[PDB]
Design a protein around this ligand. Structure first.
Ligand SMILES: CC(=O)c1ccccc1N
Ligand SMILES: [Mg+2]
Ligand SMILES: [Zn+2]
Ligand SMILES: [Zn+2]
Ligand SMILES: [Zn+2]
Ligand SMILES: [Zn+2]
Lengths: 206, 207
């Protein structure tokens, strides 16, 4: 059974957060110039395309990306539809079967345009954390750039999720995949000092 | 149990790069004190830093870019073998291993293993290795050094021949803390539309 790509393409047309570094890939040394190889240079914000946050992003004493447990980003995941909801909390999630789930991906179907930064997204309410924590959920993923509203500076959801040991994955592309169980892979790069990492997220149907 | 094991080089500002190539840089542009909410970071690097894959574009102007690459190649059963104390590695040195049904192969040269220094000399792969591995069904080869060709070679025989036989390339895996044998491997490139390679997080789990 094939792996399916649920990552946003990364190129110089991708959207970023306002005030983040624009994405740049450029060929530093071409093959004409080097005599052998095309060699690339990559400049970006960590939070561009499909990626994971580390606690250090929103907490000065938080863990950096390399201090994170890799076991969390690989394994069984459940995918659910939570479209047409302004916000998502305990109430909206109690209707789903979630027993023994370790990793949960939410399809909001809210945006899905990797080249535009949205004006508004559905966010997670802070009661979601104790609820998911209690069920054993270590990772939550959403198909939008954030778990908190776009203009919120408190980042309640970020803080609460990581206080309950739930890790965060943003900007997965879920419109071409059905609800259900899969294996997930979405590993961060081994960055010693970083606040997050882009990843290649992929899934395979159980 | 059966935990995944990291076989990637740590990426930080002391990592080595190819001579004259973009040095690696992770830096906080705007801190949480300054912004009132978030540490805002910037990542600058060469593609060919730390553990990473090559795409055919890197050495062929008409080669595929990273996103054109088949992801199924970079996930699945792999075999690890020890080829230390060899100046070069070809058919001859691999014929002593039983390699039937293998799709992905990792070679421990134990030649260098210092992520913070760029080596003066490495063991390279000879070009006869490609038909040999190709015939057996091998789609990916990995080495614990920065290149499959010698550090100063401009022809890049090994690169060209590997990809001409549909064998993909993974460089700078860290193998000294892992035993030979069978594993599941994961080493996926980032979804880079226009790039000549991608860094990866390579990990393995014992079968
Ligand atoms: C930097 C890089 O990728 C490179 C440059 C010269 C020769 C071989 C290489 N892999
Ligand atoms: Mg052309
Ligand atoms: Zn983020
Ligand atoms: Zn976030
Ligand atoms: Zn390379
Ligand atoms: Zn190479």
């Amino acid at each position: 059974s094939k792996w399916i790509d649920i990552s946003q393409p990364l190129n110089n047309d991708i959207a970023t957060w306002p005030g983040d570094t624009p994405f740049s890939y450029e060929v530093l040394w071409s093959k004409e110039e080097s005599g052998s190889v095309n060699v690339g240079k990559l400049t970006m914000s960590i939070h561009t395309g499909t990626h994971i946050d580390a606690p250090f992003h929103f907490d000065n004493d938080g863990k950096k990306v390399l201090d994170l447990d890799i076991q969390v980003y690989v394994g069984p995941t459940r995918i659910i539809d939570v479209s047409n909801l302004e916000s998502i909390g305990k109430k909206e999630l109690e209707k789903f079967h979630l027993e023994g789930v370790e990793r949960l991906l939410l399809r909001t179907s809210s945006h899905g345009k990797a080249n535009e930064f949205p004006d508004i997204i559905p966010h997670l309410r802070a009661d979601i954390a104790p609820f998911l924590s209690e069920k054993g959920i270590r990772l939550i993923g959403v198909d939008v750039p954030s778990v908190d509203p776009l203009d919120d500076k408190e980042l309640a959801a970020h803080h609460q999720l990581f206080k309950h040991s739930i890790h965060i994955l943003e900007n997965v592309v879920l419109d071409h995949v059905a609800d259900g169980d899969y294996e997930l892979i979405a590993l961060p790069l081994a960055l010693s000092d970083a606040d997050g990492s882009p990843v290649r997220a992929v899934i395979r149907p159980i």
